[PDB]
Design an enzyme around this catalytic site. Structure first.
Site, PDB file in Angstrom:
ATOM      1  N   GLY B  32     -15.231  37.504 -15.875  1.00  0.00           N
ATOM      2  CA  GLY B  32     -16.616  37.733 -15.596  1.00  0.00           C
ATOM      3  C   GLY B  32     -16.873  36.717 -14.731  1.00  0.00           C
ATOM      4  N   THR B  33     -16.633  36.788 -13.284  1.00  0.00           N
ATOM      5  CA  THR B  33     -17.486  35.683 -12.379  1.00  0.00           C
ATOM      6  C   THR B  33     -16.340  35.003 -11.603  1.00  0.00           C
ATOM      7  N   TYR B  34     -15.052  34.711 -12.350  1.00  0.00           N
ATOM      8  CA  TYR B  34     -14.054  33.991 -11.517  1.00  0.00           C
ATOM      9  C   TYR B  34     -13.090  34.933 -11.102  1.00  0.00           C
ATOM     10  CZ  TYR B  34     -10.851  34.498 -15.585  1.00  0.00           C
ATOM     11  OH  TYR B  34      -9.828  35.000 -16.382  1.00  0.00           O
ATOM     12  N   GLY B  35     -13.252  36.437 -11.181  1.00  0.00           N
ATOM     13  CA  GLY B  35     -12.366  37.405 -10.420  1.00  0.00           C
ATOM     14  C   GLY B  35     -11.075  37.404 -11.239  1.00  0.00           C
ATOM     15  N   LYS B  54      -5.236  33.775  -7.428  1.00  0.00           N
ATOM     16  CA  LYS B  54      -6.653  34.045  -7.775  1.00  0.00           C
ATOM     17  C   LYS B  54      -7.373  34.631  -6.650  1.00  0.00           C
ATOM     18  CE  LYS B  54     -10.530  31.701  -9.686  1.00  0.00           C
ATOM     19  NZ  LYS B  54     -11.216  30.653  -9.927  1.00  0.00           N
ATOM     20  N   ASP B 150     -14.914  17.791 -17.305  1.00  0.00           N
ATOM     21  CA  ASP B 150     -14.800  19.026 -18.159  1.00  0.00           C
ATOM     22  C   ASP B 150     -13.360  18.821 -18.872  1.00  0.00           C
ATOM     23  OD1 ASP B 150     -15.838  21.342 -19.528  1.00  0.00           O
ATOM     24  OD2 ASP B 150     -15.106  22.490 -18.125  1.00  0.00           O
TER      25      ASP B 150
HETATM   26  O1  LIG Z   1      -8.195  23.569 -10.963  1.00  0.00           O
HETATM   27  C1  LIG Z   1      -8.532  24.112 -10.026  1.00  0.00           C
HETATM   28  N1  LIG Z   1      -8.467  25.838  -9.851  1.00  0.00           N
HETATM   29  C2  LIG Z   1      -7.626  26.478 -10.557  1.00  0.00           C
HETATM   30  C3  LIG Z   1      -6.512  26.128 -11.428  1.00  0.00           C
HETATM   31  C4  LIG Z   1      -5.771  26.780 -12.158  1.00  0.00           C
HETATM   32  C5  LIG Z   1      -6.262  28.190 -12.282  1.00  0.00           C
HETATM   33  C6  LIG Z   1      -7.183  28.677 -11.357  1.00  0.00           C
HETATM   34  C7  LIG Z   1      -7.930  28.002 -10.736  1.00  0.00           C
HETATM   35  O2  LIG Z   1      -7.443  30.175 -11.486  1.00  0.00           O
HETATM   36  C8  LIG Z   1      -8.070  30.557 -12.700  1.00  0.00           C
HETATM   37  N2  LIG Z   1      -9.459  30.842 -12.581  1.00  0.00           N
HETATM   38  C9  LIG Z   1      -9.999  31.123 -13.506  1.00  0.00           C
HETATM   39  C10 LIG Z   1      -9.466  31.130 -14.913  1.00  0.00           C
HETATM   40  C11 LIG Z   1      -7.987  30.730 -15.069  1.00  0.00           C
HETATM   41  C12 LIG Z   1      -7.378  30.451 -13.989  1.00  0.00           C
HETATM   42  C13 LIG Z   1      -5.799  30.282 -13.868  1.00  0.00           C
HETATM   43  O3  LIG Z   1      -5.104  30.786 -14.543  1.00  0.00           O
HETATM   44  N3  LIG Z   1      -5.217  29.223 -13.206  1.00  0.00           N
HETATM   45  C14 LIG Z   1      -3.927  28.807 -13.093  1.00  0.00           C
HETATM   46  C15 LIG Z   1      -3.162  29.108 -14.459  1.00  0.00           C
HETATM   47  C16 LIG Z   1      -1.767  28.615 -14.487  1.00  0.00           C
HETATM   48  N4  LIG Z   1      -0.951  28.474 -13.382  1.00  0.00           N
HETATM   49  C17 LIG Z   1      -1.792  28.218 -12.538  1.00  0.00           C
HETATM   50  C18 LIG Z   1      -3.064  28.733 -12.078  1.00  0.00           C
HETATM   51  N5  LIG Z   1      -9.547  23.738  -9.245  1.00  0.00           N
HETATM   52  C19 LIG Z   1      -9.994  22.325  -9.201  1.00  0.00           C
HETATM   53  C20 LIG Z   1     -11.157  21.943  -8.682  1.00  0.00           C
HETATM   54  C21 LIG Z   1     -11.492  20.630  -8.852  1.00  0.00           C
HETATM   55  C22 LIG Z   1     -10.588  19.600  -9.350  1.00  0.00           C
HETATM   56 CL1  LIG Z   1     -10.947  17.780  -9.493  1.00  0.00          CL
HETATM   57  C23 LIG Z   1      -9.385  20.129  -9.879  1.00  0.00           C
HETATM   58  C24 LIG Z   1      -8.486  19.137 -10.558  1.00  0.00           C
HETATM   59  F1  LIG Z   1      -8.664  17.922  -9.442  1.00  0.00           F
HETATM   60  F2  LIG Z   1      -9.228  18.612 -11.555  1.00  0.00           F
HETATM   61  F3  LIG Z   1      -7.134  19.428 -10.762  1.00  0.00           F
HETATM   62  C25 LIG Z   1      -9.217  21.433  -9.707  1.00  0.00           C
END
Ligand SMILES: O=C(Nc1ccc2c(c1)Oc1ncccc1C(=O)N2c1ccncc1)Nc1ccc(Cl)c(C(F)(F)F)c1
Lengths: 265, 336
Positions: B32-35, B54, B150
């Site tokens: 819900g909201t992250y696609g 994603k 977080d």
């Molecule tokens: O971390 C992200 N995006 C991201 C990362 C992983 C995944 C993703 C988006 O997609 C998702 N969205 C919603 C729910 C679950 C997922 C998912 O399952 N993901 C995934 C899982 C397993 N393998 C690969 C990817 N962004 C970010 C922003 C700022 C900062 Cl600072 C930093 C950091 F510097 F701290 F690292 C990172």
């Protein structure tokens, strides 16, 4: 503050310090319709349209800098007829505000600022009335990210320059003029060709010359290829010679008709 | 008009579509909201490596999406997640993010260490290596003036089978956002700015959980959350004036004064808690964690100093692969 000291590893440095020869090569495409002097005047003019735009939205200078760079990047690769620069410039400002963490510009606010600034401050160039709506801004935004390859973090001479005048030790007597001269390098391709620390050093050097301070000791103490920064100095002096002979308000409109335009289906 | 046609069609005969470049069935998650996130494989045989696709839920480009794309686009550290490309569909203005795919994470890994029965202690070597890679990644970020804000086990990914076997990758899967089990005390007392130190506190929470397999500050369900503070005090004890002199300066100190009487936590301390979970008070591991888990934020040690701890010089030593050379028993991600 993010990535503030990563410039030697940034995409900025790794993908956007272009070679003058490639810039001039791809620039040959617009030169059939336009002259070299007119082109400069055109990109000087849209720096001023972006400055004016950000001024009206009360955006901080570096937001406005990043937007100016966005613009210079796009048309360093693509023609002036690819996307109408009047659409591009507000789009750059719009992308910078989001990216620069400043905050999304109100959709109503972006179009109103566009509309008002052409009307108020640029009526000699455009008699038409601003023609684009939020629909076009968002479409153009996608073309902008695509072209930049999503490099959105941009480095500017302001930060290195503060360090320099502070660590050189008369910060209050040099920085106002040197900051203005940094502002003024955005009338040129400098941000595309040299790291901002070199730009900033060349802007400090001119400010000292203007205020007659002799900082030769300090500069020779620095370990920096002076022959490189001296090129920038020449550009900045060429910048001021250009300013004198340019009457944007009396020249720009005929240059705007000269400039190639987008073709329909 | 706005854009020249020849320039549009050329871009529309050269651009890449995620639908034609990747085989993506393996819906790792829907939100819900992250696609949607899929486990994807390149359609060319070029590499067998797995990727995460994603699709962002909203149309257009969010500001949250802008800052995420722009940040990830500059970060290069083996222990922070990698953004490999961004795909923009101009027709349906949707945005696709491609990451290198992490099969595991600490939430699922810790959860499996309690699903098998009473908890089974995690391999000490894995715990050291997990913390070390988490300290390398957060340090890198912090040294680029990037605050995570977080930190919690679900955000710590672990690479599975492949060339980065067992390597921690730090992510932020709820970056659009910005349980309080990992939130530093000053946040609970009303602090208005995020800090490097708040991250370090969350790292210690994760560290205690790796050692004890329980969430140290776990609590039932305003900036101020009284019941969460009561868990911190129950574990840590109540802080003395010497321990956190500027606590008086907090916005919620008056509420803390009105809602708590320090005498309640007389027998409460980290030593006393960590003793019940078989962690000995003379270990190198307990001392470090005590340094991470410090009430006063400016008395809390930094990520760089923690990497410098003798704990990582003791035996066993941290390995690039947190799984040593052994078999990975944690289940892989299920499709939807
Ligand atoms: O971390 C992200 N995006 C991201 C990362 C992983 C995944 C993703 C988006 O997609 C998702 N969205 C919603 C729910 C679950 C997922 C998912 O399952 N993901 C995934 C899982 C397993 N393998 C690969 C990817 N962004 C970010 C922003 C700022 C900062 Cl600072 C930093 C950091 F510097 F701290 F690292 C990172």
């Amino acid at each position: 503050k993010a990535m503030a000291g990563n410039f030697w590893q940034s995409s900025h440095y790794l993908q956007w310090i272009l070679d003058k020869q490639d810039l001039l090569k791809e620039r040959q495409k617009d030169l059939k319709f336009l002259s070299e002097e007119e082109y400069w005047k055109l990109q000087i003019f849209f720096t001023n349209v972006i400055q004016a735009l950000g001024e009206h939205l009360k955006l901080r200078q570096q937001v406005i800098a990043t937007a100016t760079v966005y613009f210079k990047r796009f048309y360093a690769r693509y023609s002036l007829k690819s996307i109408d620069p009047v659409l591009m410039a507000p789009t750059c400002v719009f992308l910078a505000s989001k990216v620069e963490e400043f905050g999304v510009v109100s959709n109503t606010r972006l179009i109103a600022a566009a509309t008002s600034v052409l009307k108020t401050r640029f009526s000699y160039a455009f008699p038409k009335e601003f023609p684009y709506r939020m629909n076009h801004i968002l479409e153009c935004e996608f073309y902008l990210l695509e072209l930049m390859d999503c490099c959105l973090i941009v480095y500017h001479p302001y930060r290195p320059l503060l360090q320099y005048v502070q660590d050189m030790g008369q910060e209050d007597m040099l920085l106002p003029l040197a900051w203005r001269i940094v502002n003024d390098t955005y009338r040129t391709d400098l941000c595309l060709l040299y790291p901002p620390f070199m730009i900033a050093l060349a802007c400090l050097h001119v400010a000292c010359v203007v205020q007659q301070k002799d900082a030769r000791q300090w500069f020779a103490e620095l370990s920096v290829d002076m022959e490189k920064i001296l090129e920038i100095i020449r550009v900045i002096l060429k910048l001021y010679e250009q300013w004198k002979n340019f009457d944007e308000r009396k020249e720009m409109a005929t240059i705007l008709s000269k400039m190639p335009k987008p073709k329909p289906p | 008009s706005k854009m020249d046609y020849d320039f549009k069609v050329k871009l529309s005969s050269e651009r890449e579509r995620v639908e034609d470049l990747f085989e993506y069935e393996g819906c790792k998650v829907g939100r819900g909201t992250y696609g949607h996130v899929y486990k994807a494989k390149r359609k060319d045989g070029k590499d067998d490596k797995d990727y995460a696709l994603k699709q962002i839920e909203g149309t257009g480009i969010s500001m949250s999406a802008c800052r995420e794309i722009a940040l990830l686009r500059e970060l290069k550290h083996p222990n922070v997640i990698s953004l490999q490309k961004v795909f923009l569909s101009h027709a349906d203005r949707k945005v696709w993010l491609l990451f290198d795919y992490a099969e595991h994470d600490l939430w699922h890994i810790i959860k499996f260490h309690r699903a098998s029965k009473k908890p089974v202690q995690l391999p000490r070597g894995m715990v050291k290596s997990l913390l070390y890679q988490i300290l390398d990644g957060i340090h890198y970020l912090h040294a680029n003036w990037v605050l995570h804000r977080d930190l919690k086990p679900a955000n710590i990914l672990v690479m599975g089978e492949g060339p980065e076997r067992g390597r921690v990758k730090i992510a932020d899967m709820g970056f659009a956002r910005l349980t309080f089990w990992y939130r530093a005390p000053e946040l609970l007392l009303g602090a208005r700015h995020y800090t490097k130190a708040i991250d370090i506190w969350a790292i210690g929470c994760i560290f205690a959980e790796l050692l004890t397999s329980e969430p140290i500050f776990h609590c039932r369900q305003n900036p101020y959350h009284h019941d969460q503070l009561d868990r911190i005090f129950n574990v840590m004890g109540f802080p003395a004036d010497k321990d956190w002199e500027d606590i008086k300066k907090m916005p919620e100190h008056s509420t803390l004064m009105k809602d708590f009487r320090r005498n309640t936590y007389t027998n409460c301390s980290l030593i006393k808690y960590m003793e019940k979970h078989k962690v000995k008070p003379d270990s190198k591991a307990f001392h470090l964690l005590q340094k991470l888990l410090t009430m006063d934020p400016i008395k809390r040690i930094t990520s760089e100093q923690a990497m410098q701890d003798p704990y990582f010089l003791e035996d066993p030593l941290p390995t690039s692969d947190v799984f040593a050379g052994c078999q990975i028993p944690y289940p892989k991600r299920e499709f939807l």
